[PDB]
Subunit: 305 residues, 6 copies
Amino acid sequence: EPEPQMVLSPLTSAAIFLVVTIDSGGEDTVRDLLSDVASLERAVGFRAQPDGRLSCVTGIGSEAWDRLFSGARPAGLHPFRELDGPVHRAVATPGDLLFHIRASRLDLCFALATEIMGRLRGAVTPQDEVHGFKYFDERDMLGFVDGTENPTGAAARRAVLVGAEDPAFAGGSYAVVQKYLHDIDAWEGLSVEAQERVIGRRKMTDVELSDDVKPADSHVALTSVTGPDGSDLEILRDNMPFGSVGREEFGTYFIGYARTPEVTETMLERMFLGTASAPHDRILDFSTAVTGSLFFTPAADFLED
Amino acid sequence: EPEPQMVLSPLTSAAIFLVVTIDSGGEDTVRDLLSDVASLERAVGFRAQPDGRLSCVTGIGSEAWDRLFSGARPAGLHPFRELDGPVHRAVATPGDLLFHIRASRLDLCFALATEIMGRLRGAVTPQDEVHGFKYFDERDMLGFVDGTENPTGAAARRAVLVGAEDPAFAGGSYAVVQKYLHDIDAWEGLSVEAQERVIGRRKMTDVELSDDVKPADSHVALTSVTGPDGSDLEILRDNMPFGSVGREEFGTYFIGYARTPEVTETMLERMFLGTASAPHDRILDFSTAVTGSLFFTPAADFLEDL
Amino acid sequence: EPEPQMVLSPLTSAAIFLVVTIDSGGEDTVRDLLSDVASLERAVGFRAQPDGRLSCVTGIGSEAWDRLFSGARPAGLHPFRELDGPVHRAVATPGDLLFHIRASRLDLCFALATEIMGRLRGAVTPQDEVHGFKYFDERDMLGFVDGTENPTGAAARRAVLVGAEDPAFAGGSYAVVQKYLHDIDAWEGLSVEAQERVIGRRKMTDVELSDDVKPADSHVALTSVTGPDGSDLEILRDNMPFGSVGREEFGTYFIGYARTPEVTETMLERMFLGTASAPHDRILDFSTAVTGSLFFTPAADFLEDL
Amino acid sequence: PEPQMVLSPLTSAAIFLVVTIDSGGEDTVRDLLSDVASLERAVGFRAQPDGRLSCVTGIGSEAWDRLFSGARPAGLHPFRELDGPVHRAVATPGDLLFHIRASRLDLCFALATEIMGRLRGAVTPQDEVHGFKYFDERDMLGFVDGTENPTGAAARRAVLVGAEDPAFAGGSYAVVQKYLHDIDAWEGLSVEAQERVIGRRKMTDVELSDDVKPADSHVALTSVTGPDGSDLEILRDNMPFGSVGREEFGTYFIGYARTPEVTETMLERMFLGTASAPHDRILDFSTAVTGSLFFTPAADFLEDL
Amino acid sequence: EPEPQMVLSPLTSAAIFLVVTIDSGGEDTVRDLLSDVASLERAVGFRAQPDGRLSCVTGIGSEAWDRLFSGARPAGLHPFRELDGPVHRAVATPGDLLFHIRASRLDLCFALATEIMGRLRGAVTPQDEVHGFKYFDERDMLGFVDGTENPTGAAARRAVLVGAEDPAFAGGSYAVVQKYLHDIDAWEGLSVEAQERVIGRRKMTDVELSDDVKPADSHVALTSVTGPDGSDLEILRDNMPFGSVGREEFGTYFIGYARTPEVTETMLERMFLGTASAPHDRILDFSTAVTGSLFFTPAADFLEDL
Amino acid sequence: EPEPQMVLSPLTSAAIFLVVTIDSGGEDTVRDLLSDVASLERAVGFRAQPDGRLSCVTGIGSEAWDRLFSGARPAGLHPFRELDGPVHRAVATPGDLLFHIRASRLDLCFALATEIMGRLRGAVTPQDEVHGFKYFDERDMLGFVDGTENPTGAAARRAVLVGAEDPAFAGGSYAVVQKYLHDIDAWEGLSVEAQERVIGRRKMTDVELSDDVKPADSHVALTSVTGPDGSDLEILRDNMPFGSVGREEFGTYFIGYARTPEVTETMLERMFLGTASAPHDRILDFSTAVTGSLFFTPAADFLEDL
Ligand code: HEM
Ligand code: HEM
Ligand code: HEM
Ligand code: HEM
Ligand SMILES: [Mg+2]
Ligand SMILES: [Mg+2]
Ligand SMILES: [O]
Ligand SMILES: [O]
Ligand SMILES: [O]
Ligand SMILES: [O]
């Protein structure tokens, strides 16, 4: 039965992330837009086929769900949980709707964003807008290849899409976003070897460091989680650089999709609160989260009504 | 011959415009950067050949010129002249240095901008930063094809590059920038036929309206100027959309290059002050200028040799 | 179990449509060719992989089916039904075989057509041959984007392929073709807003007109059908422009695939005969059908086993 | 003086349009000629840099005299019919030529539509061919077509009128012939026999060596040296065309040269033969059904009307 | 399914074939590498996505299987069988591990091969290393299109992947490799028509010769085998040219995958030993095999978990 | 101009370098081939236009020049001069003819090489054959971007092509080749920072190290040469990786073109013999030259008229 949104997108080099809150009285305007967003996606993107690769994934937060709909809630939907670690904090910030807009070119992203916000004028308040761009060798702002170990094909379907465990919402997914700002001057004072020790992979060749040399507090060490049976727990990420040279903002916009938020939240706890072997993820010594929100991205059929 | 900077670039779909002023004491840091900016362009761009098409054109304002260099000045170099029209105004805003960075993708522009501003930290103050993107059919924010009548090839070299009239600065050019914000709601209330009358060309097919029907106050009518020579006076433009949907900013970043500022300045007078037959350019009823600066972009050799 | 033909093709920018009748005595030659047409598609196409995207969909008409095969007929196969509306007429023209050839380039289409017709000469008579091309950004000759609301992925498979309702023929599809010629002079005398009222979508941006404003005799209004159960009835279309400038022929070659012809036929009745609120589809005031035929496109394994 | 785009990049699509000028049509035509470059930019600019749309406009001998007064190009005359013992090169009407080329047919067709829209009621179509590149620069006989064309400066020198006719410098002369091929007869030859007709190898496009290339091969007869020992060259941009239902398989020949004498010498050798060769063997499988000669002026000549 | 390795790869235009033997003591080094080969594939390939199309298929020979693993063997796994025909011989040459590395560019192949062999240094001995390149119309060194009749889609999965007949090893496949060197001077002395009679297809157009003219000793005739049920038995091939102009080596590296080696072995017997109708495959009069090995390529899960 | 060979090629991602010696008696065969090498470039290349970008540059050695040609010699032609440094040695190896073949794909290079060697069979002896491939981000085998500071456009024409200083040979160039093998084990034992000190540029970003930190014995410091005039002396390099993973050969094939050999030879003396402040180029601590030859690459017209 259920047609998912375009959560599993091809590689795209541009993105717009748009996070808004729904104002008092705005619920009907929002409901109308949600039922049309797929046809807007086609209107803007069809004529730019096949290279445009335009898609929009729409997500709805826990409090907004209760304002918009009655009846069943997705089983895993709750507000993003703040993490107050000994050193680093993951903040929770307001957000009722997410539009994750991706394409091969920024203009297509912007054209679709314009149409969406045009219909929502007067009903919502912008909280965050980020124009992301991938570097040409899939590198992020820290200079490392970003995306390598994402699951693909059936492994990805199994990791990201709600199934039989919550059958009313099958084909949906849960998205966590965080906007990170980096301290680039501190980062660039590390040697490459030191940087590799923070991430857990070689910088130029993107080969994973072996088990015997990878630090316990490296990013890859802490975000590798096995579940009860010893299989790996996976998420699908599509992190995007963004910034402004004039204001000295250099950032990574983190977005992670998973079939239940528990996987993403466990990775976050390991990063921010630590383990027995690690105080915290070393990447956080160069990266500060300034937003944090959780959304449910329903199956596309759910929005079509 | 001297080597010009990459004023005549291929079509590029992304740009960063950076305008800065030079702080007290900043001149030495700036001069060092100017002499390396071509090698930064190659360092960032060479590994992304041949698709990247990264280039950087560096321009220097009138006041800055005198702080940085002694000796001759380019003949046409002066501060941007405000035009206070009956209805519309072309404002002047501060700017000592211009970096016009272009490529096929934004990331390359950003990488080069990062390196340039890294070398200038503590010597300059940012005045403007715009990340521009072209729409997929060469359209601008108003929905019209933008660039069609630009000169190409030898006609472009002749229109844009200083020559024997100022031989110490041959291979340079003059750049005018203005950031425009549009009233999209007003524009979208016009019919297509009305919009065509404001521009002077057909929207869908980009065919110029004939002389017998194009209004005197259309954009194309007012920006067509013939010189005393009988010849058309031409500039080279590379206008770029930009914006922010959350702030409702929809804009066109205008940049026009010419061998002398007099050509560009004449067009601006016609648009803002009008003619015998036209109050002002109708495009300005949907577009407000919020910056305005003039720069000289020297030949590449001039910068290398510092 | 069954392998369909390439009804669900990627976007392709060239097509040849070939419609022939089977002469008396030609049946054996045709049956031989049918069993080899997949081989020929590989012979011509393989060397241009992966970019060529060459495919041939072969369709058989109602009367030809009875000449070629005995045993079961697909449940929905009949001759195209002529529609005699008060103003506009959908003609039925002869056609026994359809070859719908698509690729990313016309040379591949032509090469495969040449091989097919080479085997069939002496057994068939050509009735229609159209060379189609993609026009800009998926536009048709009326200047509108064409294909936007086609179904994709799973919804496409369900709308187009025969399943358990006719299990001997599962994996087949029904194709309806009509060649349309446009009155471009009349069309271009409309304003863009009036054209948008004929189609039901915005011209430049391809955004559907809202329920508030979309006329009931617009093309989009009349070709939207909900079935008894409230769900939409969808077809898959791959309309191609064609023309000749010196003859003033500007055309749309319509082809629509569906799992039963009744969906397509309902859409046709609405367009030509009208509804309570709409006399006929306004697009027909600028479009004349000069061919009309219906074919069954069997699963690929049906053709291989002859 | 700026030439028209006679020297085009390689393009995979073309439209050739040949028309006659009706009585009274001269003024409409002159107005169009002064706008044709503008139309080329309007249709082509939005598809840059890939589109490579160009239009070369040519004027026949009788038409020149109806449109213009004063001095005429030195070599401009009606195509000369050649009545050989076996094969004939016919002359057919044509006052104006539009040779429209691009990387896609749609651009060609859009420009042709605009041109003919302006000429409606002043001209009568004589010939319209939509050409396509066939595979790896092959023609309808299955041989690579284009290999020995001149390039760069050698091409400029072979095709552009210069100091020998200074009032018309930057112009060129175009000869067109539409050929139909008897493919059934051609395909009855072995590959080795076909190679003997053309003078090059079929699969590899290597020229046959001088000791085995026949005197009546196409390459032998179209190789001409001038009195000073240099090669006389033309620039060709032959295009396949056809209709499978009518069994029409064709080559649209177009040859540009700085004087029609070069092209005409080649044609005489092909149709009328030499001491050692009755005629070009390619003509035993190829019938000319059109023949016209045009002068393609410098671009400034057309702008200034 | 279990997840197979990338046996069914898109068309790729470069390859490296690496065949090694495992030295005494090398077993544990090899086992460690096998369990990381998929992650090396992603490390080298990810940053060149989506155009890179880098994949590595790893296979294990019969004798090596017994050294490396205890427990079940794949049912079809045995050493390549030498064929000593009346005229032509298929030699068997040593090989424990196969790395079949494919991409759209040689450098990706080479980078992955470097990482693999860097981990194996001192545990293995290289027996064969071939750098292959496709000619631009999918042609091989004899000038014929190579790969036309390969199965695709479901037919390919059914032909190449082990299923319920050996359920512990489902998702695996069997690969046979042979390096062939060609006598190009002799081949070029045949007419095209004679060459077509050797292969069984037309050279220029790649159309199969009809049954009435195709010789019984042509390559296509002898490699067509039907199974008990009258269905064709198919393999998947990805033959690659290679060579050295200075040494006058012009070669075809044959690799054929099948769900059981019996299919491939039948074809080889027909080619080298002949049949009642055919002395041997005429292609062997212009081609000499200088290597021959058989490998099992396990499902990707099998490699991960050990 | 006279017409030069394609010394200034676009970026190409494949190359074959072929060096041969002329056997005695072979001179007539070679002169015949030289006069046809341009037509063979077109025969192989034209059908792959415009993407193939196949070119062949043909170079002749000092001693071969004397055997092949009647009259005057290019002024700078002599045998490669061996350099016997205190630690490292640049060897001179035999080479009469160089074919420097480049394209976007290796098959086109191989096809042209095959045709050339076909005509030379029996008259020449191969000395070296290298199949080169570029890494995906213009990197060399040491992991550094390679080519960044090459001259471009007019500056390239002036650095590379013989002009009025030797007017009978205007439009020619001089090529130096050296095949280098690297000690990758040693190199990979250095930290990135230490590697950056050997080369003189940053590894990841390719930014040149600043003057106050760049070592005197870095590659970039030693290969930067100013002439008498204050101006920089430039060469045009097209270095290609090559190798074989089984034999542990990881190589850079150096080729440098210049309008006089003096530029290239100065750079070589600085690398191998050192300066006041540098013993030798640190890159040579990880790179061994195993060939070395010098050739004159005539204008295209010179070769055509033989
Ligand atoms: C306000 C934002 C601006 C927009 C959106 C805009 C847009 C356009 C458009 C759509 C065209 C027609 C197609 C073309 O040839 O590019 C055009 C032409 C032109 N514009 Fe603008 N323009 C702007 C500002 C300016 C300014 C400030 C100047 C001069 C100072 C200028 C000078 C020209 C010129 C010279 C032409 C070509 C006229 C000719 O046809 O010969 N534009 N512009
Ligand atoms: C009948 C249709 C024609 C066909 C199919 C055709 C085809 C070919 C082919 C395959 C070649 C060899 C490859 C190449 O260099 O382009 C060639 C060469 C040539 N053709 Fe034609 N051709 C035709 C008519 C003509 C005509 C009418 C002329 C001259 C009036 C002509 C002049 C040439 C010239 C000059 C060459 C190059 C000869 C050289 O190597 O120097 N062709 N043609
Ligand atoms: C010198 C080695 C070889 C060359 C150059 C070669 C070349 C070709 C060519 C040109 C074709 C026809 C087009 C196609 O369908 O790919 C073909 C088909 C085929 N080859 Fe080979 N081949 C070689 C060795 C082998 C070997 C050793 C086998 C089997 C063990 C084999 C099995 C096949 C099969 C199964 C076909 C398809 C037959 C069909 O039409 O059903 N090939 N080969
Ligand atoms: C092992 C052999 C070689 C390797 C791996 C190598 C590598 C490099 C690298 C990585 C660069 C910096 C990037 C660039 O501008 O291209 C470079 C620059 C350069 N190399 Fe080499 N190179 C080699 C041999 C040579 C030789 C033998 C010469 C001269 C005869 C040479 C001359 C140069 C020059 C002139 C530059 C540019 C310096 C400048 O003006 O910045 N190289 N080389
Ligand atoms: Mg016939
Ligand atoms: Mg024998
Ligand atoms: O991540
Ligand atoms: O503009
Ligand atoms: O030709
Ligand atoms: O094969």
